[PDB]
Design a protein around this ligand. Structure first.
Ligand SMILES: Cc1ncc(C[n+]2csc(CCOP(=O)(O)OP(=O)(O)O)c2C)c(N)n1
Ligand SMILES: Cc1ncc(C[n+]2csc(CCOP(=O)(O)OP(=O)(O)O)c2C)c(N)n1
Ligand SMILES: Cc1ncc(C[n+]2csc(CCOP(=O)(O)OP(=O)(O)O)c2C)c(N)n1
Ligand SMILES: [Mg+2]
Ligand SMILES: [Mg+2]
Ligand SMILES: [Mg+2]
Lengths: 545, 545, 547
């Protein structure tokens, strides 16, 4: 009798389901598991804080449609991981957080166990599902569920709880192998009702001023060719939400991004593609026509009529829907009014002109617009990068200024406006892709995951971090209104040199005060493939609050 | 009619309740509140991550018996703060986390608000209470409750939710002033049943081998003189739990710490003073006599019989209890058997001898024992510091080796074994005391709150950070068992120089490889009162897992 | 080697802790547990629905200060009992609900087990603590905690989860006996700050118009003699809340009940004794002087400053605080001003006279006032009874009109205004005391637990149920506003005869349309000690609608 244990079973389950990376922080009881997973050919990436590890996991699920794996220990590590699990769920990114937990009997009586918490029920409100495995023969089915749940419907976080004892529990090795489940097709296609598809084309054909909105669901769907084809056939102006930038290149002629306010105020029929009417679209109220009619393509029927009533729900998975939308268009082709495209273009150009003047006008110190014009100069010549971006002014201005050329290349604060996602998204993106990453970081944003620069160095990841050091949150020029001369609630240290942090870890730092310095430092950064911080001196007074 | 708003009301409530510091991270909707609080003479301390701010708040409540105040924004900031609120509750440290929340009507319908979450119900499982204020006329009563709840019973975290709209809501300034509540005596004395006090002395008088255990509740109580007096009158050997070190100096003759295992294995009557029989005392099972009888002084009746049956519960607040224990002793004095004190001392000395040999034996590279012998050399000559300590080996060895001379001077990982508490406890301790802090940090532990070094610099706090750089979690010598040469799950960067991090922020760094270097670097550190990192090179193989 | 199992251990643990009654409803996996508990001398009371079993447990807790035991099966049984656990925690009544649950491994993975629900987490929001026991050797200590938690602080419900596997799990009998825990003094006395006590007496001694308020915390504490001596010594007028009626008799010359709103509107110093400034006291807001100063005796510091700022908190158990208050009074005596007592008495008199016209005036049909005057005349002669009461007009009028003479004899809708406590309360009160119970029930109220009349007949309990049948919720005279002639939302069947329900179970029914018939039926009911229903024909227009 050859015998095995839960730890070995779970690692084998992960292997057969083609998990090739784990993002984590170890400690009791999970160290041996991570060692063995690595032993078994799984890439283990160890972080300085579990939050970043969970952010890396979610980033990777967003890029692949395969759930990223976050590994943590019991209560204090689990809780740090839980904050990233929550954010994955909110954003619709698939991931599974696997955490050690303590002794079920002790925790159930609340006697004060090591790292005691009911982790399973603690995760429930933040996860699509929360599963706990008490028997090693159930590990494989439990992972099967975790995988399916994480990628079906609107994708999200799943919590898988592994009590210390299930990892130690033994079974016959042969029988164990029969309990392992390899999931085929974890999220099947769900096709819309044909009649809703035909109503959708019909209402679009009757539209005087149609607009398509592409959200993260559109991006996640990988239906890039189908979307382009639909948009181009009917010449329908579209707006990309932040992380849908690049499905079609941002400089595409049908992009209404440069006159977004005007487009939303005037469109008479709006077609949401995996985009919620949440605060990011002002709930379809402020800045919109009183009378807009909506078509909505969403995988999740519970999202329909969440905010404004939806004339044409088109419920099913987005690729499937666009397949059928395409076929129905071919049977009943139309072209969007030229006058609409034309009035759009009029606004687009006035706005690009005003932008251009801000972008080409040099200043000392640098502001957000000339600084980002410099970044854009370099990124135009380096189109195969991933862009991670977080902050306030640093976020809004980079979103508007940096164009994306390819789909699923932008990672940012997201639906909850989280400061802290940059390092982890940077690591998840580069581990997943093997490509360089540029992280354009506000200086407050940066400090929420800063220590992860050590991890970037430890794994020799090609990430260049560009910090917009304006000396604080929004602006660097706050004053202590007491007359006591203390830093104001929004000030960070006057003239901090973030590029130096890298000295500690044998990585590259540049300090940049001008666009020419910035251009050089950022080009070298990317082309070197070395971990790098670029500290960018930004006028403390360039930001708005 | 002079009019005021919720923001102004809440700041005034905080002022009248003698809140003089707020630890926080701002953003929407709380920036204006922090600015005004600072305007009104409240010291605002702004962090890089809310977790550290909440740790600072809890540290300050532990030292003062006054709840520390943690201020955050809505969902993503609230969630980061929640992880420190949870830890305060677990440890029995008073604090109030005040967070902005969004629009109640939008969140209640789950329509996708800005930073949407039911923060109130999210905090419930981690807090003594969670309150939400919808009317500005209720702000003062709500803060009154927050304060009382946080400090009564076993102290803990309280969540106070302030929707964006209550901060904007206006009322007549004069009437507003009548709605503000100044709490007098937030936690009244609770005196034990006289009969339980007399049973307690009685069972102690009959004891052959009595032992007292002092927990964090004993420490928090500030009953230092009463405890010393009781222990010395009856000559009762005591053990200090980690953060009760220093109530009586650690070198006190009645301290059984150097033969802790023996003391617990043999004591026949154990008197718990604000110490739980949780995992930290192995639940009163493994390493204890089959037949130990317990006396327990605890403020919380729900803690009695949690683990082992308790012969003599003494329920009431600890100062009150020790008052009555003292009076009853005087009426019925006894002395602990000399033979017990003597056998204890026999073990104590054998153990101090073995320790001494590890401590005085020089090595290259340094190990935990000679390194800490060096720290202890410096701390003997600098007794007015606060000691923050976290890690694994760094934690266990510093606990055993560094003596405390005064009460409530040690801050560490605590009941949940949290890596990440060091910077925040360091900042909370120095802001609260005005004294220097020495943080003895494992290198994994450090990276959970590292970025807070900027904050230490921004406020020019006298904190010296001593990092035990063994190159990883527990040990620095892990190997990738795949044969791929990747860092093992436990390795951090080979030879990272954490002292350099300080360059970024205009603070002091030392690298130390020997005890003489360490001694010099640490003395200068403290006496300079400058923010400092000491990177200490530790044999990667000195630790145990 | 003699073996035992979890089921045997928990029963022994109950026995050693002096549990002598369990209220429940059996089924998988607890039927054998109940059988064996009964075999071991524990009295088993089985119900038609678990919520009444849970209501009976919490009544038994309030009466005795020993947690009542409610037993249920898994998910659907559990959830019914949980509604009653909720009510106990809200009212401050100690009880423990012990529920069987299913297989931990299956429920943890949400595979659709038999009766699947994480019952422990389900109970958490409604209970002082929720515990779950996985190992048989942990059963005794789990019960010890449940007991201590249920009775310490402000008492409340505790949930104790017994997975089917733990009940069947075996261990050696001798080793098993060593893991049983007998709790001595589960709620220790907690003594107030003596400074609080001296400040309280001094504020009372400065008051021009002091008022004591007795809450159900005062009734639960069992400090009847200390509260009475304190009140009578300084001659402080007192208001009893509903379930505090009778600590001192309601006819006591110092009761301000007959002038409640005057008393609250005009007192300058008010001493709350286990009484919360919650909605039953209008939060200390509406109907109170603008600057009332409060002294508050409560065991729970969390309750202080909940609503109004409290001038003098006196935190500790009510018996110990009253012991300190009396000793401080004896050192520093004072007598409430005669003028305040005399002016209260003038208002009590105006109100008492208004109430007397209503009570004494005959009507056909009967109304609440003359019907209850007849009930009061009967109850004055039977001061050993327990009074259960619920409904709306039926509750408020009985509460004002039926005087209590002894403490802890009145049981009602309580803090959450629950309809459906009536039969549970009647059963727990009679089983607990051995005494007759009279339940004065609104007809809508009764229907929430009416099938428990079979339980009452099964155990031959001395319960007389008097239903004020006005044909509806508040009133029986509603009309369908659409014109279709359907019953209105507040109507119940016109002229239902609830007295006839008892023929199913060999109980006694009376139907009564007059005060003389009511008086006779109710007297015969009480004396008979037989399960009885009295259907009282009340005017459908007599009631007012709350809101
Ligand atoms: C975890 C978290 N904490 C706090 C906030 C509130 N918040 C919004 S923006 C921001 C930082 C803004 O400054 P910065 O990143 O430096 O960019 P800048 O505006 O200065 O370019 C913060 C802390 C948040 N969104 N997330
Ligand atoms: C937030 C959190 N994450 C993970 C753990 C698990 N854990 C225990 S010790 C430890 C770090 C141990 O190494 P280190 O701090 O460097 O001290 P050393 O043993 O090397 O001296 C970790 C991550 C924890 N307790 N808390
Ligand atoms: C469990 C529950 N359901 C509903 C209510 C709402 N409610 C208040 S009083 C009442 C019944 C009133 O009628 P009745 O009991 O017949 O008294 P009457 O006023 O007619 O004498 C109800 C159902 C409640 N309080 N509890
Ligand atoms: Mg900034
Ligand atoms: Mg280390
Ligand atoms: Mg009725």
């Amino acid at each position: 009798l050859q015998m095995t244990d839960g730890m070995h079973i779970i690692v084998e389950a992960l292997k057969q389901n083609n998990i090739d990376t784990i993002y984590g922080v170890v400690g009791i009881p999970v160290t041996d598991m991570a060692r063995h997973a690595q032993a078994e050919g799984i890439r283990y990436i160890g972080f300085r804080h579990e939050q970043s590890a969970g952010y890396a996991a979610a980033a990777s699920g967003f890029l692949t449609q395969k759930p990223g794996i976050c590994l943590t220990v019991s209560a204090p590590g689990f809780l740090n991981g839980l904050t990233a699990l929550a954010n994955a769920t909110v954003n619709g990114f698939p991931m599974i957080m696997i955490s050690g937990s303590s002794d079920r009997a002790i925790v159930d009586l609340q006697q004060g166990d090591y790292e005691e918490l009911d982790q399973m029920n603690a995760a429930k409100p933040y996860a699509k599902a929360a599963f706990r495995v008490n028997q090693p023969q159930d590990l494989g089915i439990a992972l099967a569920r975790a995988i399916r749940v994480s990628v079906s419907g609107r994708p999200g976080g799943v919590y898988l709880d592994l009590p210390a004892n299930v990892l130690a529990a033994t079974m016959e090795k042969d029988e164990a192998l029969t309990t392992i489940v390899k999931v085929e097709n974890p999220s099947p296609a769900l096709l819309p009702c044909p009649k809703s598809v035909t109503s959708a084309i019909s209402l679009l054909a009757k539209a005087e001023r149609p607009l398509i909105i592409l959200g993260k669901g559109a991006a996640y769907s990988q239906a890039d060719e189908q979307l382009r084809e639909f948009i181009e056939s009917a010449q329908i102006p579209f707006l990309p939400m932040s992380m849908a930038k690049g499905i079609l290149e941002d400089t595409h002629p049908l992009s209404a991004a440069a006159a977004r306010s005007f487009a939303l105020a005037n469109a008479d029929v709006v077609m949401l593609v995996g985009a919620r009417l949440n605060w990011l679209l002002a709930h379809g109220k402020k800045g919109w026509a009183a009378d807009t009619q909506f078509i909505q393509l969403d995988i999740e029927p519970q999202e329909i009529d969440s905010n404004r009533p939806i004339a044409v729900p088109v419920v099913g998975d987005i690729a499937s829907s666009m397949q059928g939308m395409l076929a129905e268009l071919k049977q009943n082709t139309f072209t969007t009014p030229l006058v609409w495209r034309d009035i759009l273009n009029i606004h687009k150009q006035q706005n690009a002109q005003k932008m251009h003047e801000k972008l080409s006008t040099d200043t000392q110190p640098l502001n957000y617009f000339n600084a980002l014009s410099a970044v854009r100069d370099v990124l135009r010549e380096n189109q195969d990068i991933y862009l991670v971006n977080e902050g306030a002014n640093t976020l809004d201005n980079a979103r508007n200024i940096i164009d994306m050329y390819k789909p699923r290349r932008r990672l940012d604060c997201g639906t909850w406006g989280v400061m802290g996602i940059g390092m982890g998204y940077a690591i998840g993106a580069s581990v997943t892709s093997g490509s360089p990453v540029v992280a354009i970081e506000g200086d407050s944003a940066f400090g929420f995951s800063g220590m992860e620069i050590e991890t970037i160095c430890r794994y020799n990841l090609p990430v260049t971090i560009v910090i917009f050091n304006n000396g604080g949150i929004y602006r660097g020029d706050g004053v202590d209104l007491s007359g006591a001369g203390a830093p104001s609630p929004t000030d960070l240290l006057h003239h901090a040199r973030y590029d130096k942090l890298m000295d500690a870890f044998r990585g590259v730092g540049y300090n940049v005060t001008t666009t020419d310095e910035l251009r050089h430092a950022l080009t070298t950064g990317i082309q070197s493939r070395k971990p790098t911080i670029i500290n960018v001196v930004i006028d403390p007074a360039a930001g708005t609050e």
